[PDB]
Design a protein around this ligand. Structure first.
Ligand SMILES: Nc1ncnc2c1ncn2[C@@H]1O[C@H](COP(=O)(O)OP(=O)(O)NP(=O)(O)O)[C@@H](O)[C@H]1O
Ligand SMILES: Nc1ncnc2c1ncn2[C@@H]1O[C@H](COP(=O)(O)OP(=O)(O)NP(=O)(O)O)[C@@H](O)[C@H]1O
Ligand SMILES: [Mg+2]
Ligand SMILES: [Mg+2]
Ligand SMILES: [Zn+2]
Lengths: 96, 193, 96, 564, 611, 93, 61
């Protein structure tokens, strides 16, 4: 990891490796890479806190690997959960 | 007014220290001021000057306690604790206290004040180990505090008798005993025709 | 393992990007650019420094993050103003 | 020479004769703040003048600019000055703008006397000759340096002072050649100022355990940077602890017993006041042997605790609550195991004080607390002055913590020391991970441009903590050549860098003649040559300040300098 | 074995009698001071026990359950010596411990810790009723009528199986008349939220305290415990038994007062800090900037949150009519405006508070719910967020996403300060006197400032009239403000604001959470200011102007306003006028307080209605 | 005032002046040898360490001269500094 | 009660304070020219102790 992390252009190698069997969509692969690594969460004197996770909305036309990009992130991320439309409730998300 | 409210009818503990500092104490001088037959001199106006111009190193003498503490602040003195600050005499007083519930033992009026002064300023001059003296001064302090709490069950319109109570033990109780006996007297004299 | 910090050389870029993004968001049905979308440029810059496995955000990570956030704002506009917005934001879209 | 070790009683009796009266304050002590040895020296010296009833004023001073300001405004009734911890290496007669003719009285007879004496208690060298020979008002105290070391300079000084053509050319350039070699020596500390004042208390007959503890504290502060000097003085401190300790052994502990033992005092960070784990993790020496910044160094630390047979969950307990069996077995555990890691030098005997039932503190742990009070106890001319006021204000926190009545302020100090050493470490790792030490052939450069809580390093002492940590780290590595190091840190508010020049040192167990801080000349000589804006006003003249844009031009001429 | 116990006891009598620092015998003095006020306990700090003789700490920490009850008898023997004259009684004293041993995280408790003294911390989620344990059973035989007694100490004994002197196999009955008993209470402790591992539900311990440690806590308090981690043989697996803590010392972190009839628990060294602070001429600037220092702008919302934290003054008339003293505030506005960051701040500054989301809530979970106890099979009542937050603030985030059946349960608890119940044969009115701070979005997310101001707002006039200040927080896109926010937000992420907030506290421009929480707690106990007779002349002449203004705005809009002015909003301006007098500890409210209370109402509810 | 005037009625502003004038008339007479406005805490103390709490520069007082440099410390007879302690220029005792 | 004033006692003590305070100043003129200072320290601290009792007495009455 330490060796490859200092490859010139490591970001664009890693982005090209997000869902490598999905063609094009480099802006989605870029957004997926950022969400999949995340930012840094912050707490300020103990008083206040800032969100470190990056949220992503894939909005678009049918048959464009929006669902295949999400099913790839379920294989790739450490802890992950998948949910779908009418199959997900207010308290099946969240808690009950 | 001219006098602060917390002094209006009683002494501060620092004024009770000032009164006790006016007593004679025995010392061993570490200076010879005595001139031989074969120089500055004391010339005091509230105490006997003739004791200080005649000091000889390590022959004991009496001086007023505020001078003994001023000499002992330099290496120039050592303060001889009174006979009642011995582990023998304190332990006889503790036995007296336990044996006679009805009375306080014949400790001198300044015993708490002088113990507190000498344990801080003259800590090295005791023949007994000072941790056993502090221990017995506390044992005496606590027994007399029980006897005081028993005595306060008898506050009265007429009088009390408190025979061997220290000046510092009177001075903590003064604004309670006298304030309550004053209202018992006002409630009583009001009833009279 | 990696939790990247910021060098504070970003102040003029990120402030002008936020001011421009807010000023061009006066359009009625436009994306809701908000203080939580300034804060996003800072999260995305930290995610790129994590991809380089760095403990420090560089100005190239701040440029890649501004490019991602500006491109995703401009691509959400109507074709009637997408030309004006590409032309207006060029210093930030062509920054990487 | 000026007052040799044999004749400190004469200098003291001269203070009593000149400056004892019940009428007035007559004695002023100027003490360099930001120096623990000057602090412990001045504490002893105030307990002495208390007992003699000498009315006195103590003024803490940050640097030479404040020395001129405070000297300039002394009331003319003040007829003795002590300069504790500074001024031996500057020409004080020139610097303070003295002319002795404005100070002389009763000139009759082969005689003089003066309306003021200026006694210099200083351990730095090379001594300025116009103080040590060339003045009758300035009155230096000596460890022995002048008679032992300066005899050729004495002769050269006088033959050149007398001589106000072959026979002249042949000699004036011999004697100026001796002085020109005497200057062009780097700075060093050669004694503790507290061991000098304890040898004065030994001449007067004033020694006791309170003055001996201040002697041990003042001298212990040298051990981090002048180990060669601590080892000369340490044998003499052992003898005084035996001489003053009372007869009793197998003694019962009581609230009144002070005991000042010589016993194992492991070279670890705040052991009795922290965990056994933090003791190793934050130690300069341990970090240097294990390479403990990077995570393989942290593995070597756990792998050591596992091999010693101490659970991490026990090693991390606060040392009071850590169990009774480990704390007595620990001498045997270390004598078995440390050798495997080369940590064998951690075993050390030191001075440990315990008062009553309040639990022991070592001289090492107590100076870590007292320094942490100096460091963090609380329009650029206002931005400097309201900062230098803070460092004068902190001197009285360290002072009051020397009193046994004020253990809560020592306990503030012991918490602050653990906050600082953590910040030093979290910065020192950033330097070594990010490779910020550049090799410039003549010296090593390090420059902190940005970072977390960087606003600590504007105090000269906190910059020297990080300096001493980076030096120990380098000095143990067997491949690096020993080179002077320059450590710079920015203040974003004043817009200057605080720059410190650091001597390297030999690895902590190897056993040579000393090496000297010649940045003190190189910075002056480059400053005199340039038109740059700098401050050269600190008493440890290895430390300077420079405006942000002038730094790279300054370093660019430092690498050319033949003075290092 | 009793030779061995006598030496352990003798060694602890000598700890009490000999332990001294400076001039003072701190444990002899503490015993005497506790005997006079009649609490028969001693608090011992374990650094002092280690300092006196470490062998005693070794003995104690090796097997606590066998050594704690020997130190309790050593305390009673000293307690007799220092407070009764011999040769002319006290109960068994409690030992309470203080410690700085490392806190064990509640989930790291396991078999390595059984029977050890363990220090930890958590949030109390429950307290039981008190129960009676024996300390002395008087005893009599069923058959031969022999009589004796059993002293009991409650660590890790039962009725004897033999008559002690055929008399029978189980001979003894307890004489209740002559027996003596002690209080015992059960708590449940959840672990601290910032210490729960990823994705787990927060773990829980039951634990027991007795005598002077009972009633020392209430649900929601954050505490540190010292206690013996130990086991009991519950009937609720194989060779398995339930862990609990025998509590030896509760230590509430902030001096949150516990069960407390407003009693004078403050100390003069902090009371004199507050009594100087009250008299600072800039106090309202200092408290305003101390609210959410990392949130830029929103100055009036901070000024109103300060009023909400004080409240006004509660009043009880000779009529028997009760007047609400608590102030309620609604933050209604556009996305990303720090509404939720201000709710997450008031949860921390308020001495009692609960943060909740209206979407994560129920009527029963907010007010009070009827539970069924599985042993008695009876119904019993459990308090929801409004009962947990009682005497404090409930922060209701996402108040627009709450169901219409759940929002209505709050209507009584916002005005009459009670929760009425008639369910399962329980009926009561519970007291619940809280401020409500609420955050919401309009219909359509943003405010849509061109649309009718009543068509943006979902809420009925029945709930809107229960809020004393309503802020319609519009976001306005002014470039100079957006740069002023952008610079500020970046200074938070880059770590500059940390040092600035430390420097402003040192400058006296700001106060810490701990100081502010204790200042609010003091003002609520020293002030309930009345209006001066001249303050009434101003508030009356103002409120009839606000009604004329409303009537004219309704005549333009051709309808009843959606944000109302009613007499419940005159009492809001009165109640704000008192809150501003509580800040500076004024005994009375004046024309200068009335001017700022009218201004804050104008800047909130009236400029919100004016839209 | 032996060593807020908006709050007082005008008769009290007057009375306070006439009473300060009476105090100075008692100490300015016979009984001048004792400073009646002086301390009622007994002189149990001879020399004291005092820390100078506010800068006030070189100042005179009847007994002598001090340079009150911010955070310097003096060891001096209590009777000389007692009025400067009361004015709050000095700290300790 | 307000007790009756010690008329002759007070005249005597106010003489001795005036004479003694002049004597301490006169002895301090010898120090310009053994020369041990303890008796000066005691003569001064005694006047402070005595002046305190009289000030505390008069301020009380
Ligand atoms: N860019 C692409 N490159 C390669 N395969 C693609 C691409 N786009 C879509 N496909 C494939 O075609 C199918 C459609 O992708 P899918 O993820 O199911 O569509 P989607 O974008 O989520 N559309 P939808 O479910 O209707 O909203 C999958 O089998 C993909 O593997
Ligand atoms: N004025 C501000 N000053 C500082 N930070 C701000 C400010 N406004 C917004 N933010 C930050 O941006 C985020 C705003 O989110 P939040 O506080 O949850 O918004 P909100 O007002 O509750 N909006 P919403 O829940 O969408 O109705 C937080 O991380 C804030 O710290
Ligand atoms: Mg799909
Ligand atoms: Mg929100
Ligand atoms: Zn029987």
């Amino acid at each position: 990891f330490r060796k490859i992390s200092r490859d010139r252009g490591i970001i664009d190698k890693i982005i090209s490796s997000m869902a490598p069997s999905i063609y094009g969509h480099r802006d989605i692969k870029t957004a997926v890479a950022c969400s999949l690594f995340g930012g840094v969460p912050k707490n300020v004197n103990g008083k206040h806190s800032i969100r470190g996770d990056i949220n992503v909305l894939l909005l678009g036309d049918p048959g464009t690997a929006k669902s295949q990009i999400l099913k790839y992130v379920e294989k790739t991320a450490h802890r992950a959960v998948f949910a779908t439309g009418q199959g997900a409730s207010a308290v099946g998300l969240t808690a009950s | 007014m001219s006098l602060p409210a917390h002094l209006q009818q009683t002494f501060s503990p620092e004024e009770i220290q000032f009164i006790v500092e006016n007593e004679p104490i025995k010392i061993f001088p570490r200076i010879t001021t005595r001139q031989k037959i074969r120089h500055t001199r004391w010339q005091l106006i509230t105490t006997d000057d003739k004791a200080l111009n005649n000091m000889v190193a390590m022959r004991s003498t009496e001086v007023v306690l505020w001078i003994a503490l001023l000499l002992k602040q330099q290496s120039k003195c050592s303060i001889v604790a009174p006979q009642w600050l011995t582990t023998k005499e304190l332990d006889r007083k503790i036995q007296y206290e336990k044996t006679h519930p009805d009375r306080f033992s014949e400790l001198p009026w300044n015993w708490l004040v002088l113990a507190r002064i000498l344990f801080n300023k003259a800590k090295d001059d005791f023949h007994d180990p000072i941790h056993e003296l502090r221990g017995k001064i506390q044992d005496l302090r606590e027994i007399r505090q029980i006897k005081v709490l028993k005595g306060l069950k008898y506050l009265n319109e007429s009088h009390l008798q408190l025979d061997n109570l220290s000046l510092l033990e009177i001075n903590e109780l003064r604004p309670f005993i006298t304030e309550i006996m004053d209202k018992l007297r006002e409630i009583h004299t009001a009833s009279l025709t | 393992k990696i939790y990247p910090k910021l060098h504070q050389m970003d102040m003029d870029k990120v402030s002008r990007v936020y001011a421009d993004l807010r000023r061009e968001s006066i359009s009625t049905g436009s994306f809701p650019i908000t203080v939580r979308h300034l804060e996003s440029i800072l999260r995305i810059a930290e995610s790129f420094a994590k991809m380089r496995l760095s403990e420090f955000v560089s100005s190239y990570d701040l440029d890649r993050a501004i490019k991602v956030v500006v491109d995703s704002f401009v691509d959400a506009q109507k074709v009637s103003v997408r030309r004006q917005l590409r032309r207006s934001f060029a210093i930030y879209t062509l920054g990487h | 020479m000026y007052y040799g070790i044999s004749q400190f009683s004469e200098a003291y009796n001269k203070i009593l004769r000149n400056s004892s009266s019940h009428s007035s304050c007559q004695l002023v002590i100027f003490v360099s703040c930001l120096n623990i040895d000057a602090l412990c020296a001045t504490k002893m010296l105030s307990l002495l003048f208390k007992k003699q009833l000498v009315q006195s004023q103590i003024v803490p001073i940050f640097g030479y600019s404040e020395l001129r300001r405070h000297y300039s405004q002394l009331d003319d009734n003040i007829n003795s000055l002590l300069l504790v911890g500074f001024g031996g290496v500057i020409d004080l007669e020139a610097f303070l703008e003295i002319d002795p003719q404005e100070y002389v009285i009763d000139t009759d007879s082969g005689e003089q006397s003066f309306r003021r004496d200026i006694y210099v208690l200083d351990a730095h060298r090379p001594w300025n000759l116009d103080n040590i020979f060339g003045s009758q008002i300035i009155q230096c105290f000596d460890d022995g340096t002048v008679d032992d070391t300066l005899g050729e300079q004495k002769e050269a000084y006088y033959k050149l002072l007398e001589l106000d053509r072959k026979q002249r050319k042949k000699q004036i350039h011999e004697y100026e050649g001796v002085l020109e070699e005497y200057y062009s020596q780097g700075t060093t500390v050669v004694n503790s100022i507290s061991a000098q004042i304890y040898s004065l208390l030994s001449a007067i007959g004033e020694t006791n355990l309170s003055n001996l503890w201040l002697n041990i504290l003042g001298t212990t502060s040298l051990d981090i940077a002048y180990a060669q000097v601590y080892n000369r003085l340490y044998p003499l401190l052992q003898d005084e602890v035996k001489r003053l300790t009372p007869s009793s052994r197998n003694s019962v502990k009581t609230p009144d017993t002070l005991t000042l033992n010589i016993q194992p005092d492991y070279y670890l960070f705040l052991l009795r006041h922290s965990s056994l784990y933090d003791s190793f993790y934050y130690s300069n020496y341990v970090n240097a042997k294990l390479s403990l910044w990077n995570e393989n160094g942290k593995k070597r630390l756990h792998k050591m605790f596992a091999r010693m047979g101490i659970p991490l969950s026990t090693a991390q307990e606060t040392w009071l609550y850590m169990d009774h069996s480990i704390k007595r077995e620990l001498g045997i555990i270390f004598d078995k195991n440390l050798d495997r890691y080369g940590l064998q030098d951690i075993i050390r005997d030191g001075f440990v004080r315990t008062l009553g039932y309040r639990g022991s503190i070592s001289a090492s742990e107590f100076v870590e607390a007292l320094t942490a009070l100096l460091e963090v106890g609380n329009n650029s001319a206002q931005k400097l002055t309201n900062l230098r006021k803070r460092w004068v204000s902190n001197f009285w926190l360290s002072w009051d913590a020397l009193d046994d009545r004020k253990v809560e302020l020592l306990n503030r100090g012991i918490q602050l020391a653990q906050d600082l050493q953590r910040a030093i470490f979290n910065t020192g790792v950033a330097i070594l991970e990010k490779k910020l030490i550049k090799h410039l052939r003549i010296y090593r450069l390090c420059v902190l441009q940005d970072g977390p809580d960087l606003d600590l390093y504007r105090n000269p002492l906190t910059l020297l903590r990080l300096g001493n940590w980076l030096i120990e780290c380098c000095a143990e590595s067997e491949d690096k050549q020993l080179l002077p190091m320059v450590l710079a840190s920015i203040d974003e508010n004043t817009d200057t860098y605080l720059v410190a020049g650091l001597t390297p040192r030999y690895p902590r167990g190897l056993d040579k003649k000393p090496i000297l801080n010649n940045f003190s000349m190189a910075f002056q000589q480059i400053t005199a040559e340039t038109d740059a804006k700098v401050r050269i006003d600190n008493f440890e003249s290895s430390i300077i300040e420079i405006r942000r844009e002038d730094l790279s031009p300054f370093l660019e001429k430092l690498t050319l300098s033949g003075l290092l | 074995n009793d030779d061995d116990n006598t030496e352990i006891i003798k060694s602890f009598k000598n700890f009490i009698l000999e332990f001294r620092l400076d001039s003072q015998f701190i444990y002899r003095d503490q015993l005497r001071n506790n005997i006079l006020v009649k609490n028969y306990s001693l608090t011992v700090n374990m650094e002092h026990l280690i300092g006196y003789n470490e062998d005693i700490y070794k003995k104690l920490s090796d097997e606590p359950s066998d050594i704690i009850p020997l130190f309790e008898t050593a305390i009673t023997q000293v307690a007799k010596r220092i407070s009764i004259l011999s040769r002319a009684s006290l109960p068994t004293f409690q030992l309470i411990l203080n410690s700085n041993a490392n806190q064990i995280p509640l989930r790291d408790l396991d078999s390595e810790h059984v029977s050890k003294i363990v220090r930890l911390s958590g949030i109390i989620i429950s307290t039981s009723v008190l129960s009676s344990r024996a300390t002395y059973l008087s005893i009599m035989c069923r058959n031969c009528r022999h009589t004796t007694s059993i002293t009991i100490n409650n660590f890790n004994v039962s009725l004897p199986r033999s008559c002690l002197s055929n008399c029978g196999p189980d001979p003894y009955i307890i004489i209740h008349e002559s027996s003596k008993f002690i209080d015992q209470q059960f708590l449940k402790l959840q672990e601290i939220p910032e210490l729960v591992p990823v994705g787990e539900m927060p773990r829980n311990l039951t634990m027991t305290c007795d005598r002077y440690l009972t009633n020392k806590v209430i649900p929601g308090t954050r505490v540190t415990i010292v206690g013996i981690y130990s086991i009991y043989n519950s009937k609720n697996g194989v060779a398995i038994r339930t862990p609990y803590i025998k509590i030896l010392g509760i230590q509430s972190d902030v001096e949150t007062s516990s069960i407390w009839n407003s009693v004078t628990m403050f100390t003069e060294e902090e009371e004199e800090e507050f009594l100087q602070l009250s008299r600072n001429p800039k106090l309202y600037e200092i408290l305003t900037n101390s609210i959410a220092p990392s949130i830029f702008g929103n100055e009036d919302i901070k000024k109103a949150i300060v009023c909400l934290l004080m409240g006004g003054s509660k009043k009880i008339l000779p009529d028997g009519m009760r007047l609400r003293g608590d102030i309620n505030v609604l933050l209604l506005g556009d996305p990303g405006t720090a509404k939720s960051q201000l709710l997450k701040f008031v949860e921390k500054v308020s001495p009692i508070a609960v943060y909740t989301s209206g979407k994560g809530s129920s009527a029963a979970g907010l007010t009070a719910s009827v539970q069924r106890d599985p042993m008695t099979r009876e119904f019993y009542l459990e308090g929801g967020a409004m009962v947990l937050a009682d005497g404090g603030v409930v922060c209701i985030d996402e108040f627009d996403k709450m169901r219409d059946e759940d929002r209505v349960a709050i209507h009584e608890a916002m005005e009459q300060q009670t929760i009425s119940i008639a369910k399962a044969g329980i009926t009561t009115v519970l007291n619940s006197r809280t401020s409500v701070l609420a955050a919401a979005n309009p219909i359509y997310g943003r405010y849509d400032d061109l649309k009718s101001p009543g068509d943006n707002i979902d809420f009925q006039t029945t709930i809107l009239s229960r809020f004393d200040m309503i802020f319609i927080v519009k976001d306005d896109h002014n470039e100079e403000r957006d740069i002023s926010i952008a610079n500020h937000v970046i200074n938070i992420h880059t770590g500059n604001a940390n040092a600035m907030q430390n420097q402003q506290e040192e400058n006296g421009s700001e106060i810490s959470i701990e100081k502010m929480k204790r200042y609010i707690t003091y003002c609520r106990l020293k002030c309930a200011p009345r209006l001066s007779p001249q303050a009434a002349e101003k508030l009356s002449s103002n409120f009839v102007t606000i009604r004329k203004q409303l009537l004219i705005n309704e005549l333009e809009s051709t309808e009843r306003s959606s944000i109302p002015i009613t007499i419940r909003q005159l009492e809001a301006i009165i109640r704000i006028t008192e809150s501003l007098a509580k800040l500076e500890l004024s005994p009375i409210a004046q024309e200068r307080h009335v001017d700022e209370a009218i201004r804050l109402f104008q800047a909130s509810t009236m400029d919100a209605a004016s839209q | 005032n032996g060593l807020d005037t908006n709050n007082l009625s005008h008769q009290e502003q007057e009375y306070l002046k006439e009473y300060c004038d009476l105090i100075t008339d008692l100490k300015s007479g016979d009984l001048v040898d004792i400073d009646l406005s002086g301390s009622l805490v007994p002189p149990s103390d001879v020399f004291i360490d005092v820390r100078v709490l506010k800068d006030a520069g070189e100042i005179q007082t009847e007994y002598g001269v001090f340079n009150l440099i911010k955070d310097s410390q003096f060891f001096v007879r209590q009777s000389d500094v007692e009025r400067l302690i009361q004015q709050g220029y000095l700290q300790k005792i | 009660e307000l007790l009756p004033y010690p008329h002759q006692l007070m005249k005597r003590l106010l003489n001795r304070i005036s004479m003694q305070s002049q004597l301490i100043e006169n002895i301090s003129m010898g120090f310009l020219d053994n020369e041990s200072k303890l008796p000066l320290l005691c003569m001064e601290t005694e006047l402070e102790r005595l002046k305190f009792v009289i000030r505390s007495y008069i301020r009380c009455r």
